[PDB]
């Protein structure tokens, strides 16, 4: 290998989260006061590393934190039931943990906390958060096997009810890229509706990585997914491999989906930094 | 390995099963007379065995016995076009039989009835079986490979049409175990809605058992997963591992079927029986 | 092995398609003025293969064609946003290129074409092709690798809205195949809704080819698939494996898609001809 690998985790790590209300109405996470994004920050950790999240809530409603995938007790499970939400104006240290994988007493394999997940409210409008997801509650996480290939950069698309990142229709998002870049997707999946996301001149393997180790992984390769509320995936693609440059659609390919919006462009760029057919 | 693991199969078995109408007017399957549920029991079996079924109806409605994944020649395929479904009090044998996997003269591999299947009706209400399973009649079934791992345990949660297990919203089921059980889920959507099934605190292996062999299994790891009318998958989980123990929610993550109903609690109890943040 | 498996891929094929609106008001493709057909004819390439295929619209609105999986240049992405559609009664020359898999200069694999593919309009009604598509503009592409498991025969089975390749409700369509004869399904799914794939008697492994190399596959073995719009795969049986000759049923698993069409008959003969329970 040759290209930038993650490393052994294991480390202890601290941050800081709030939930806002926004001034257009939509709640969202930030890493700061005044900084809340919708879909929230990416969290990326190494398996074994363990997350100690000092989270606010700024709202006038109670709030929670909930991830997928990651080893939490139950005090950071995040849902009213057990009492792990936080009151408006109030303060709580959710702690998530991952594990590498490996041989239980009983010669088993234990999993491994790698993959593509996500943390979303649980508690806002209903006990079950679909109030504050539906306003913009969520966000991306990311769990690497020691070994995994890194990219030069990650984006995340959300197919939130008829909205991608709960933006007005036909407004993207947009990501760019040069020909040979490593990028990287993470899309999550909340609201009511299944969709099914598709990208134009790229493919990917269904599996946990969405990349191929070699030529013994039997994997579907796909351009096409079906996704539900609450699914997370991810992947990486080379930008125009084999293709070249140009705006290449992803949208949601249920037909009327991508009628009324839910359509964005992968604009792949040539080093000058055109895009063939595509005018600025 | 030291977990007790599936023996080779290869044995003719016998079991009697009966479809019944129930007070409540749902209609079910049970070995014994006056004993049917909602779902039907659990059937297991070894790769290699063949069951002969000697299944009778008791309803005053024509009933049948389909099988999904196992082996059945045309008179065991349980609908009225092969008029292998049964008349009101009648009786009838069906034979499935399962095979290992192994080499074809031509030098490909033969699959293995291995896997998390189920039956149901095909005939009442339509001939599809829509009444029938509406109103109960659907059970899993489990074909074991040899060396397959054994649970402590195995439950089954069924998602047919806004019920689990054609139950009153809200009420479950509830399982419980206790932490370091190793605890086997079926899972069965029936009916006319696709779904998306959570849990809580733990992950599984999307494969066929659900369980990694060991570390180049690249299946993704995965604590979501959508499925639709007639899907069967199960799997196998350390109940509270790396978690501790907790009332662990697990829900139709598709948010308005997770709030008129739609939820139930895995309760993994420490062995002094208490759940933290749990009242009983 | 001693069963017909690809070759290696590597030649220039060249190809007329032709889009016409037929008769009954359907828009299809064909290799051949007056030959278009809904499905589409299938295209088979070898990984290697570059494909330039003549493309002409003899219908008076515009059209185009769009493949999933292959390789294209923007130039034949065949949407009305790169200009890459085409006038009524215009011509376009697309090109389709497909790789083989292998080791990129940083050491990480790059997957490979292969699989289970479709082709489709992009721009008929809509610019995402919703009248297109809905009136028979789609058809299967099948990239095979070197060393696959070639068929006796491949049937297309198409799930577009609530019909079954575009025919009325319990028109079939219907399949014939003699016990042992190798059979290849490409399964495509277009228009608004979700679906399940169901069939008798029979079951495939959830991976590109739908059959397993050996037993260090860990795939899902299934006889039911959730489909979602412009999904493909394509699976591999032997018609009547462990189970004889029968009229097999395949329908939409979901129960009200069965109850008004939406099922068909993969016929399995003996070497006479016959199949026990059904009559001609
Ligand atoms: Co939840
Ligand atoms: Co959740
Ligand atoms: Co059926
Ligand atoms: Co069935
Ligand atoms: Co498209
Ligand atoms: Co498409």
Redesign the pocket.
């Given at each position: 290998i040759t290209a930038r690998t993650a490393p052994a985790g294991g480390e202890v790590r601290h941050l800081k989260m709030y939930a806002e209300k926004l001034a257009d109405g939509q709640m969202g996470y930030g890493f700061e006061k005044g900084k809340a994004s919708v879909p929230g920050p990416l969290i990326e950790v190494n398996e074994g590393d363990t997350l100690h999240i000092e989270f606010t809530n700024t709202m006038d409603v109670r709030a929670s934190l909930?991830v997928h995938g990651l080893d939490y007790e139950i005090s950071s499970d995040g849902?009213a039931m057990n009492k792990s939400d936080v009151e408006p104006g109030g303060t709580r240290t959710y702690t998530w943990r991952t594990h590498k994988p490996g041989r239980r007493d009983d010669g088993t394999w234990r999993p491994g906390s790698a993959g593509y997940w996500h943390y979303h409210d649980?508690v806002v409008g209903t006990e079950?958060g679909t109030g504050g997801i539906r306003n913009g509650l969520y966000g991306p996480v990311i769990v690497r096997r020691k070994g995994d290939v890194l990219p030069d950069a990650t984006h995340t698309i959300v197919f939130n009810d008829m909205t991608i990142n709960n933006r007005k229709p036909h407004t993207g998002p947009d990501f760019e890229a040069t020909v040979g870049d490593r990028v990287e997707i993470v899309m999550i999946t909340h609201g009511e509706y299944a969709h099914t996301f598709h990208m134009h001149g790229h493919r990917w393997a269904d599996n946990r990585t969405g990349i191929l180790t070699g030529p013994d992984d039997p994997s579907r390769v796909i351009d096409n997914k079906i996704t539900g509320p609450?699914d997370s995936f991810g992947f990486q693609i080379i930008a125009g491999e084999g293709v070249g440059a140009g705006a290449w659609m992803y949208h949601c390919h249920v037909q009327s989906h991508s009628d009324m919006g839910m359509v964005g462009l992968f604009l792949v760029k040539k080093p000058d930094g055109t895009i063939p057919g595509y005018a600025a």
């Amino acid at each position: 290998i040759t290209a930038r690998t993650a490393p052994a985790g294991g480390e202890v790590r601290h941050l800081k989260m709030y939930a806002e209300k926004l001034a257009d109405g939509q709640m969202g996470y930030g890493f700061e006061k005044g900084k809340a994004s919708v879909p929230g920050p990416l969290i990326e950790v190494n398996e074994g590393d363990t997350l100690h999240i000092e989270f606010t809530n700024t709202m006038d409603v109670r709030a929670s934190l909930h991830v997928h995938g990651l080893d939490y007790e139950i005090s950071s499970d995040g849902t009213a039931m057990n009492k792990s939400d936080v009151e408006p104006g109030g303060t709580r240290t959710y702690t998530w943990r991952t594990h590498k994988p490996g041989r239980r007493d009983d010669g088993t394999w234990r999993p491994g906390s790698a993959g593509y997940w996500h943390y979303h409210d649980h508690v806002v409008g209903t006990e079950h958060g679909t109030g504050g997801i539906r306003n913009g509650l969520y966000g991306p996480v990311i769990v690497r096997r020691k070994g995994d290939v890194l990219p030069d950069a990650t984006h995340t698309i959300v197919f939130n009810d008829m909205t991608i990142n709960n933006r007005k229709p036909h407004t993207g998002p947009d990501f760019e890229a040069t020909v040979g870049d490593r990028v990287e997707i993470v899309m999550i999946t909340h609201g009511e509706y299944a969709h099914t996301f598709h990208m134009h001149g790229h493919r990917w393997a269904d599996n946990r990585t969405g990349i191929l180790t070699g030529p013994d992984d039997p994997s579907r390769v796909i351009d096409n997914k079906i996704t539900g509320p609450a699914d997370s995936f991810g992947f990486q693609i080379i930008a125009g491999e084999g293709v070249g440059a140009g705006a290449w659609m992803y949208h949601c390919h249920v037909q009327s989906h991508s009628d009324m919006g839910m359509v964005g462009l992968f604009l792949v760029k040539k080093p000058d930094g055109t895009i063939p057919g595509y005018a600025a």
